[PDB]
Amino acid sequence: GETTDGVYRVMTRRLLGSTQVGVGVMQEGVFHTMWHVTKGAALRSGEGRLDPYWGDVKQDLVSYCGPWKLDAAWDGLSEVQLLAVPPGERAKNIQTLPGIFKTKDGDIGAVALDYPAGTSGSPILDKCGRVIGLYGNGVVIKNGSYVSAITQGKRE
Amino acid sequence: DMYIERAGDITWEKDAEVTGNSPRLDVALDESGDFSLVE
Ligand SMILES: CS(=O)(=O)NC1CCNCC1
């Protein structure tokens, strides 16, 4: 199928019509998305099949056709852009200054933007267009708003 | 049967819409990959 680098929608025809369950990134021949989008199932790209290669439920990440390739990191100072790909809508860039998730194992950037569930896997980018993580695994805070971690994998 | 469809290039947009706050939150991550607020 299509192997061109870029952002892609992840779709299913199991439910009513064609439903967008999430989003992912094609980079260096590997497809990257969040585990909760595919639950580790195989994917189709035209007539071709993409098989899972690595995944981790706790990180909530999965890669297809090869190992995780994305290794850019948020600098902790600058604004980033969410390249939101909402269901049935055009890809759109949203610029924001991340907040922080403080955990017992270290701090992670977080973006306070709220999109439909089928937007999970959309990439967060730095000013050079590098993917610093994927949007869609987060929490609901005091005022009821959604905040996503900037989730990044490890390039072995 | 899940399938993928290209939606665009990955590029920074000059003068994109700018929004969202920057909260600093104490959080916990469980074995199932769920984040929760520590209070
Ligand atoms: C998990 S998501 O980011 O794809 N969308 C949800 C965000 C929280 N409100 C409900 C939708």
From Swiss-Prot, chain A:
Places the protein is found: Host cytoplasm; Host endoplasmic reticulum membrane
Function: Displays three enzymatic activities: serine protease, NTPase and RNA helicase. NS3 serine protease, in association with NS2B, performs its autocleavage and cleaves the polyprotein at dibasic sites in the cytoplasm: C-prM, NS2A-NS2B, NS2B-NS3, NS3-NS4A, NS4A-2K and NS4B-NS5. NS3 RNA helicase binds RNA and unwinds dsRNA in the 3' to 5' direction. Leads to translation arrest when expressed ex vivo. Disrupts host centrosome organization in a CEP63-dependent manner to degrade host TBK1 and inhibits innate immune response. Inhibits the integrated stress response (ISR) in the infected cell.
Domain named Peptidase S7: residues: 1-156
Active site residues of this protein: H36, D60, S120
Residues of the full protein shown: 1514 to 1669 of 3419
Protein name, entry field: Serine protease NS3
PTM: Acetylated by host KAT5. Acetylation modulates NS3 RNA-binding and unwinding activities and plays an important positive role for viral replication.
Self-association and partners: Forms a heterodimer with NS2B. Interacts with NS4B. Interacts with unphosphorylated RNA-directed RNA polymerase NS5; this interaction stimulates RNA-directed RNA polymerase NS5 guanylyltransferase activity. Interacts with non-structural protein 2A. Interacts with host SHFL; this interaction promotes NS3 degradation via a lysosome-dependent pathway. Interacts with host CEP63; this interaction disorganizes the centrosome and inhibits host innate immune response.
Membrane topology designation: Peripheral membrane protein
